[PDB]
Amino acid sequence: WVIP
Amino acid sequence: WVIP
Amino acid sequence: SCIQFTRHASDVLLNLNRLRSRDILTDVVIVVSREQFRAHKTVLMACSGLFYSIFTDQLKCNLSVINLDPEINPEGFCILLDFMYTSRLNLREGNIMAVMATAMYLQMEHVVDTCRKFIKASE
Amino acid sequence: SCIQFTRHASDVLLNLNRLRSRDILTDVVIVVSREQFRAHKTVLMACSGLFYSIFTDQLKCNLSVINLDPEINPEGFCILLDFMYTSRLNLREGNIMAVMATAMYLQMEHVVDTCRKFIKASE
Numbered sequence: 217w218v219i220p
Numbered sequence: 221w222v223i224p
Numbered sequence: 225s226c227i228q229f230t231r232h233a234s235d236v237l238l239n240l241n242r243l244r245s246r247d248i249l250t251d252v253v254i255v256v257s258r259e260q261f262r263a264h265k266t267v268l269m270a271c272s273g274l275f276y277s278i279f280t281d282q283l284k285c286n287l288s289v290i291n292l293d294p295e296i297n298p299e300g301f302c303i304l305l306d307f308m309y310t311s312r313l314n315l316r317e318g319n320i321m322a323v324m325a326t327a328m329y330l331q332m333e334h335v336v337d338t339c340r341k342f343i344k345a346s347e
Numbered sequence: 348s349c350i351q352f353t354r355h356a357s358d359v360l361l362n363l364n365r366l367r368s369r370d371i372l373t374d375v376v377i378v379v380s381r382e383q384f385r386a387h388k389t390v391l392m393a394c395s396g397l398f399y400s401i402f403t404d405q406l407k408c409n410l411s412v413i414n415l416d417p418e419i420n421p422e423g424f425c426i427l428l429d430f431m432y433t434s435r436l437n438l439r440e441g442n443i444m445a446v447m448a449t450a451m452y453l454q455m456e457h458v459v460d461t462c463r464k465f466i467k468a469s470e
């Protein structure tokens with residue numbers, strides 16, 4: 217999971 | 221396009 | 225010896241979400257209490273262990289309407305349906321419990337994982 | 348304020364290809380001369396300007412069979428259909444002309460681009  |  | 229187009233999978237998913245927004249080729253309505261959500265069975269199966277089980281069933285595969293358990297929160301389902309079609313999860317303090325419970329019911333393991341990690345960080 | 352799952356789009360496409368291999372929820376047969384290819388209309392539209400045009404048409408959207416132009420090469424179509432479902436293109440010296448012509452007909456601009464670049468390098 218990432219900060220887009 | 222890339223070499224997978 | 226294949227070559228691969230990096231953005232292809234993302235481009236496909238973007239167009240599947242455009243089809244959903246325009247209600248093109250949607251073949252099922254998911255009923256969550258008083259709310260209705262139109263979707264493509266193939267996308268639902270590809271994202272969810274629950275829908276994969278439902279739509280491989282020789283009788284349920286032909287249903288145009290699926291009713292979820294009355295304990296399922298419509299907003300939680302909406303957030304997860306948006307995630308299925310975009311890879312983006314609108315996870316907030318006010319919705320995390322509903323999102324995690326809906327993801328457990330829908331058998332969306334990666335979403336359950338992250339909800340667990342976000343809750344653990346706040347305790 | 349969304350979070351994003353990096354591998355989600357690839358995971359969706361992998362499951363759509365599994366559905367195609369098992370012939371689950373395929374709703375169209377594409378006829379290319381003597382050969383037949385089963386597929387999902389939604390994936391075809393998401394990948395191809397030609398299929399996007401065909402399946403948004405108020406009459407053609409309901410057809411279970413689509414016949415392509417007799418000049419279309421079945422192997423070229425097969426390679427492009429595999430690409431649609433996997434992001435992988437089996438581009439070879441012996442098939443590049445057929446792949447590029449099929450990609451032009453199907454309106455798959457990124458495939459046409461690369462075929463053009465690979466041909467230019469060999470001249």
Ligand SMILES: N#Cc1cnn2c(Nc3ccc4c(c3)CC(=O)N4)cc(Cl)nc12
Nearest residue numbers: 269270271272273276332333362365366
């Ligand atoms: N054919 C086919 C096919 C269509 N969909 N699909 C799967 N869908 C699925 C099943 C379980 C889970 C998820 C997705 C996300 C998750 O957390 N669990 C799996 C397989 Cl093995 N195959 C298929």
Ligand SMILES: N#Cc1cnn2c(Nc3ccc4c(c3)CC(=O)N4)cc(Cl)nc12
Nearest residue numbers: 239242243392393394395396399455456
């Ligand atoms: N709704 C919808 C929807 C479903 N599919 N789709 C598009 N599919 C497409 C159209 C043209 C081209 C390609 C894909 C690959 C290419 O080279 N050209 C576009 C839009 Cl703007 N919208 C949609």
Ligand SMILES: [Cl-]
Nearest residue numbers: 332333334335
């Ligand atoms: Cl997931």
Ligand SMILES: [Cl-]
Nearest residue numbers: 455456457458
């Ligand atoms: Cl393309």
